[PDB]
Every structure is written in structure tokens, then in C-alpha cells.
């Protein structure tokens, strides 16, 4: 019935989505990560901050993924014709819903956990309520998209044309886990993480190493000190 | 070894299937829906029907998806070049195995639940053992494909060329769910649902809203009264 | 930053892999297979062998999948223009990590379970530390890739150009399953199997039949006697 | 000798001292070392390097360096660790950035080169900070001598068990204390700002989780 003309802003987006998806062959991986330890850590940090700022569970994901990129530089690289481009710095781009934009957090492998939380808040507020300078959201070395706030268990995303990996984050669940108790089980919280890789650069083995390494960092936040 | 010439019926399906995947970018979402309440409602209605008609669990999905499209019209739209076509009616097409055809149920958002069951049975009978008009099965505004009757837990399906969304339904399982009982748990059935969306039209945020809205309708068949 | 020139070996794989994904449409499936019976059988066979050779859990997958191809020959076929090519023999190609190569096991539907274990070990040793004849790893009629050794729960893989199906195998886990005990449950090991099919050749109904048939063979190793 | 003597008679020294609870640090070290699984050994001194380094970022005044007519300021913290040599001060660059375990590898390699070899002259000159450890010899507390260009220097004593009042029926428990002494150039480091750096260092070390910042 009703026909709506396309906007120029959406036009380019459509072009990028289709092009990136079609040009790059995408193979997907998925695991489940235990969140018992992170929530305990988050309670201690937010308590000690005494209201200066709040650290979200998403903030742990930024640093944990960033350090995983250093240990597995292949996932952080980029593909170009006749040359495979390697990035030594990690500029993680966090996707945020906008009536969809990707602010870029620079040097995610270096800056502290709390400053990431401040950076994402300022950028998100500027993105929704104002104007971002074009470089601030173009040319990321990595991408993280979160949809757990809407109850999605698991999903797969679409990569940017220049990047080589992108994370997909589901919602935190409550699942029974076998244990040695007299009841034989206990309640633990799990989140499913799905990774989409360009198979030209990221092979199956190296992609598995990065995702497994990410699990170990997140499954015990003390190890994030390296 | 053995070589089989390709029939024209499979040939015309091929290009439509060929063009759809390489022209429409593909991103998928997935959740888990509790099916406990529905079964209780189905027992009462079937009883109320008194054999006059039968209401399958698939029939509840038809209306639940149809009403979800009204609340989220973006998923019900259709992508055309330079113009996003919008549909105020939901002609849901149901996939049925044929030695694969897609009968169309018109005005699924309006007609009653039991009338859908009669329609799907008559159309399927006409499809398998008879002949259908091309229109009867062409130009649907939505598509639902069911494979839970064969034991598939979860899957993703190819999208029709003119449409923007398609639903994938797994088999109904029996899984433990944590509870407040002295045992700490109870047995509750589940059903994995996978939605495949054209990312040019269906963003992650709006796609999550439709899948969540579909989830809420199905956990409590009282809410289908709108 | 650092730019790495692309080797011809990567170049051959890149264009071969990219062409396959951008041409062959891919629809996927997933199920969960119980490993309770398989582990018990492996204990008996390995013990009786008295150290002659070790039968891996992957070896059971090779024969179980191979016999499933015989019962569903459609999945074993190969797509060619204007003629669908049918294969009566089943040559299964197993993927092994290489700093990625696919050795081919011939007549997997005929040879015994133990000879497969010897064949896969010898080929893998030659693959990692030697030179293999091209045909020995080219022109397989099926493909199996295993990533359970790295903790991956579930994933989807790219298909070969001439083939029509490929199995993706996750890692084994320990999950609660409802039971009739006084505790109401028991611990049983599970694993997720993901199959990628060319929708031009493998329809949804026939694809489900092959995956369901694979489950029944593997869920009870006695039935592999056929 | 020339440098040592000149530094003392040209830089007016004044010292601060506190006591830091190491109960939480040892628990973390058991886990990490376990996590390392023999790949690397993280010493208690390694926690001191990062804890002091991050404290410098929060209090940049202590990291500065005094020059005539201009107070030089450093936005990077190249921490120099003193090691006994039959006494040399190797330099660990970017202590505020690199990870905890890489510091342990860096200090081990430099120490081996220092004791059994030759170091390139720049590798042990011009540090922005200095840490000297004498706990291996049983010294409870001591004060050190600063380098000419620097502004502060840490002094670390040996760890020992001391009674701490508790709410236990017994009214107390056993916790391992240690004394930290800081020597500051009073021209640059005032009493208030010096106290802030030493107090901020305590909070980072008293709870290693906060080291994630």
C-alpha cells in the first residue's frame, strides 16, 4: 500500500551492508561464557567508586575483547588486495541504537577500564543528542554490537567493509549447571557470544583461539591484569 | 556417477533462490520462547471445538506473528529500489513440504484463530494432491517455515526476493528451568525461534522489538485479545 | 601499520573460498546429539584393541555420517549446471588444522571403523609434516570439519565449490536432562552438530531427514551394523 | 659518588612513611602465578611496579622533574628499579601502560643482563621514577637517596606478620604488614600532594581489583 521514498542517509547504509556481506565470505562461531565472576567484580568496583561513575557489564567486554586482539593479532587485522594489513593498535567501535551509529573508542588495549565507561557515555550522548565529527565513527579496527538489552538470546551481525571481525552479544540468562553439591547442580548466569569472521583472513583455528582466549579473560577478571 | 537433468520447475526456483541470497544481505536473530501456556490453551480450545475443528500449535504462531507485524510495521514492509514499500495488511505465507510450496493465508491479522486452521488444512490438501493458482502462492508479505516436526532444534532459512523477514521454528524440547521450589527447578517446554531479516530495512533494534513482541504474545495467549 | 604481502597459497584459497560463498546460497541447521552411548562403546573397543590403535570420537562421526549419506543420497550429490550429478560412492574429506588442509578418506561407507582411524592418522601426519598428492585432497564428495578441540560450542562453515553439504561439529559438554529419578534428572553429555546445505540441491525437508537419520545412527552405535 | 653527594646537598630531602596491608596481594599472586602455570613468575615486587606507576598518573606532580626556572612535567612514567650489583638501576619504560606479567619478564631479563653482562648506557639513565627494594635482607624501613633529575623515590621494607585488632571473639587476627617510605624533593612535592600520592598508592595495593582502574 503505502510507499515511502528512501532517505540518502539510509541509502549509503544499505549499500554498505549488502556490499560488505556479499563481498566477504562470512563464517560464524559461537560459545557460552560464564558471568558469575564478573558480576561479583562489578559490585566491588561500583561500590568503591562511591557514585563517581558506573561501570556497566558492557565495559568489561570492551577491555576483555581488546586484550584478546593483542594476543591474537590476526582477528585485529584488515584485508586489502595483494596485501594483508596488520593493525598494532586496537580501536574498538561500539554500536549504539540511533533513530544505528558506531562510535569509535581509541586505544582500547591501553586505557583503563573506568575511562572506557566515561568515553562510551559521552560518545553515546553526543551521538543521540548531537553531531559527531566524521572521523570519530569511521575506520574502526574492530566492532562490538550489543543486543542483550532486548532479550535476544543469540544473533549474528554484518561486518564493516574494511574490518575482519565483529562480535555479537546476546542476553544474560540463568541456566542450571551440574555441580558436586548434594543437589548435584547450582544456578549460574551465562551469555552466548557469536563472532563473525572473514574466512579469507581469519581461519577456523585462529578464530577459535581468539574466542577461547576471550572466554578465559572474561571468565576470571583477575587475569585481565595479564 | 549418475547424472540427472534439471527440471524446469526446480530451474525457476533456482534463480529466485539464487538471486535472493546474493542480492539481499542476510543477518539473523534467535531467541527461546516458553511454550507451556499455549499447550494449556490448546487443550481447552480443542475440547471446546469438540472435534468440529483442530487447532495446531502452528496455528497459534500464525496469529501471534500476524499481530506482531501490526505492532512493528517495519518488519512487514518490502524493499523496492529507491522506495521502501509499506504494507498495512499481513498476507502470511506458510511453507509446507511438497515432493516446497508456499500457500498464502490472506488477512492473518484479522481472521480468527480457528479459521486459520481450516484455511491451512484446505490449502495444504489442495497443494499436495491438487493444483493452485500462481497468485494463491505468490506475492506474500511474510513467510513462516516450520521444521520442528522432524526434530530440528534450530535453523535459518533463505528469504523470498520481495519480502523482508522470514521465521524459522525448531522442535519443542523439554528443558530444566530454575524455580523457587524446594528442588529449585521445574520442567518447562521450550521452542527456539530464528528470525532472518534484510538488514537494509530491518535494523537490529527494530528487529529485536518484533521478536520480543512476538515472544510476549506467545507466553500468554490471553494477550492475543489485544 | 604493518602490511604483509599475500602469498599465492592464500590467494588460491581466498578466490576459491570467496567464489563458493558468493555463488552457493547457504541455509543452515542445528541439532543436539547425545554422547552417552558413544563413549561407552569407545571404552570397549579401545580396551579390546589392547593398544594396537585408538578410536577417536571423531572416527565414529565419519562412519555415522557416511552411512547417513547412503540412506539420503540427495545430500551426497553435487550441483552442476543443467545437470544434477549424483554420487553413489561417498568420499569424505576431513579438515585438519595446518599452519587448513582437507585430506580425503575414500569409500567411507564401506571400510570399517578402525581402518578409518588408521587412515586419518597417517594422512594427518603426512599433511602436517610432508607433501600430499593434490587429488588426495581435491574433489571430495563430502566435508567434515571439527572444532570441538578448542571449546567452540557451535559454528557454521563455508562449503566447497563442487560439494553440496558440510558438517560443523561443536565441543562436547555436560548438560542436565530431565529424568524419572527421585531427583528428576541426570547428567548426560551433549554436542551440537551444524549442517550447511546448498538450498538449490538440498531442500528443507530432505535436509532434516539426513540430520535426523544421522542422530539415530550416532545415538545408538549398535544400529551402525545396519 | 659525585652524583650521590651532589644530589643530597642540592636537593632538600624530606620523607614520608606508611604501612600497607599485603593480605589481598598474596591471594591474587597465588591465582595469577597459578594461571601462569609456570609460563612466568609474578613477584610481589611486580605488583609494586604497576601500583606505583598508576599512582603517578593520578598524581602527576610526583612524576615531574625539577629544572631551573622551569618545572618539567612528564606524561609518561619510565620507572627505574634498583638491583644490587657487585648497584645499578635498569629502566622499565611505559610502566603505566604495559601489563603486569610483561613487567616481570622485563625486570628478569634486565637483571640477568645487569648482573652478568653489559647494558647500553641509555637503558639505565634518565628514569622518571625510582623504586629500591631491600626487603630480601630483613630491613624493616629505610630512607634512600634520590637521583639528581628525579623528584621522588620509593623505599620498601621487609614484610612481617603483625597483630591487627579484629571483631573476632579473640578480638584480633594475623595480617602481614609492610612499611613504605617515600623521599620527596620539597621544592616540587609539597606535603599535601605527597600525602595524596602515598595514600593513593595504598588504595591501589590494598585491593588489587582496583588496579583495573
Author numbering:
A (entry chain 2e), B (entry chain 2f), C (entry chain 2g): 420 to 518, 521 to 647
D (entry chain 2c): 433 to 518, 521 to 647
Quote the study that presented this structure, word for word.
The α-keto acid dehydrogenase complex family catalyzes the essential oxidative decarboxylation of α-keto acids to yield acyl-CoA and NADH. PDC, OGDC, and BCKDC are each comprised of multiple copies of a substrate-specific dihydrolipoamide acetyltransferase (E2p), dihydrolipoamide succinyltransferase (E2o), or dihydrolipoamide acyltransferase (E2b) inner catalytic (IC) core surrounded by multiple copies of the respective α-keto acid dehydrogenase (E1p, E1o, or E1b) and universal dihydrolipoamide dehydrogenase (E3) components. Here, we report the cryo-electron microscopy structures of the endogenous cubic 2-oxoglutarate dehydrogenase complex (OGDC) and icosahedral pyruvate dehydrogenase complex (PDC) cores from bovine kidney determined at resolutions of 3.5 Å and 3.8 Å, respectively. In addition, despite sharing a similar monomeric fold, OGDC and PDC E2 cores have distinct interdomain and intertrimer interactions, which suggests a means of modulating self-assembly to mitigate heterologous binding between mismatched E2 species.
The pyruvate dehydrogenase complex (PDC; components suffixed by ‘p’) is an essential element of life that catalyzes the oxidative decarboxylation of pyruvate to acetyl-coenzyme A (acetyl-CoA). We initially identified PDC based on its distinct icosahedral architecture. This is confirmed by atomic model building of the bovine E2p sequence into the icosahedral cryo-EM density map, which showed good agreement between the sequence and the respective side chain densities. For E2p, the backbones of residues 420–647 are fully traceable, except for residues 519 and 520, which lack densities. Due to missing density at the βE–βF β-turn, two residues (Ala519 and Gly520) are unmodelled in our E2p model. Adjacent to the region of missing density, a putative density for the lipoyl moiety was identified near the catalytic residues Ser566 and His620′ and the gatekeeper residue Leu521. In E2p, H2 instead has a length of 14 residues (Gly455–Leu468) and is a single, uninterrupted helix. H7 of E2p (Pro642–Leu646) has a length of five residues and one additional residue (Leu647) at the C-terminus. The E2p knob has one hydrophobic surface that binds a single hydrophobic pocket in the socket. Heterogeneity of E3BP distribution precludes identification and experimental structural determination of E3BP from native mammalian PDC.
